Structure formats: structure tokens, C-alpha cells
């Protein structure tokens, strides 16, 4: 038939599905070790080949409660965290 590898040409949907899933799983498995940081990157890559992040996010939120996902969301923005860590010096009270 033919060979098999990651990101062959992308014209084929089946190859993209195979790799996309290989990454979805590989990530969960690395996190099963504890490499959350790699899960964020690998998941970001899964989105890079899917192009429909939001669909996948709904699919990830319903298949299992994802704590890593929350860290993916914290890895993305940097400036935002700085505002919070100043505006109200991280956290403040109310009366």
C-alpha cells in the first residue's frame, strides 16, 4: 500500500484525523505521566490541524473534566495575568 507517519501532506483528511487523534491521545498519555506543559503545546497543535478549536473544546469538556485545558487557557495570555497582578494586586476585598 504505502507508508505511515505524522503530518504526511494534509491533503488527506484521514491522515489529519490519524495524527490529530495521535496527538489528542499522546497528550492525555503524557499528562498521565504529568507533562501538562507538553499537553498544552500538543493540544494547541491538535487545534492547528483541526481549525475548529471550539468544537473540540466542547468535546473535551464533555468527555472528561479537563484541568489541563484550564492551564492551556492560562498559557495563552500573558499580559492579562499582569493586569490582574497589579490592578487589585492579584486579589483585594470588597465592602
Amino acid at each position: 500500500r504505502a507508508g505511515l507517519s505524522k503530518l504526511p501532506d494534509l491533503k488527506d483528511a484521514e491522515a489529519v484525523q490519524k495524527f490529530f487523534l495521535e496527538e489528542i491521545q499522546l497528550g492525555e498519555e503524557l499528562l498521565a505521566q504529568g507533562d501538562y506543559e507538553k499537553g498544552v503545546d500538543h493540544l494547541t497543535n491538535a487545534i492547528a490541524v483541526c481549525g475548529q478549536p471550539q468544537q473540540l473544546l466542547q468535546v473535551l469538556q464533555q468527555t472528561l473534566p479537563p484541568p489541563v485545558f484550564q492551564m492551556l487557557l492560562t498559557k495563552l495570555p500573558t499580559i492579562s495575568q499582569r493586569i490582574v497582578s497589579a490592578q487589585s494586586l492579584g486579589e483585594d476585598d470588597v465592602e
Binding site: 484525523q17 487523534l21 489528542i24 491521545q25 497528550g27 498519555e29 468535546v59 468527555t63
Partner: peptide, 11 residues
């Protein structure tokens, strides 16, 4: 288990 391919059976 370390196999997120549960939902992915849908496609």
C-alpha cells in the same frame, strides 16, 4: 485511562 479517543469514535 490514557486514551482520549472516546468521543473521537464519533468521526
Amino acid at each position: 485511562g490514557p486514551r482520549l479517543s472516546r468521543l473521537l469514535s464519533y468521526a
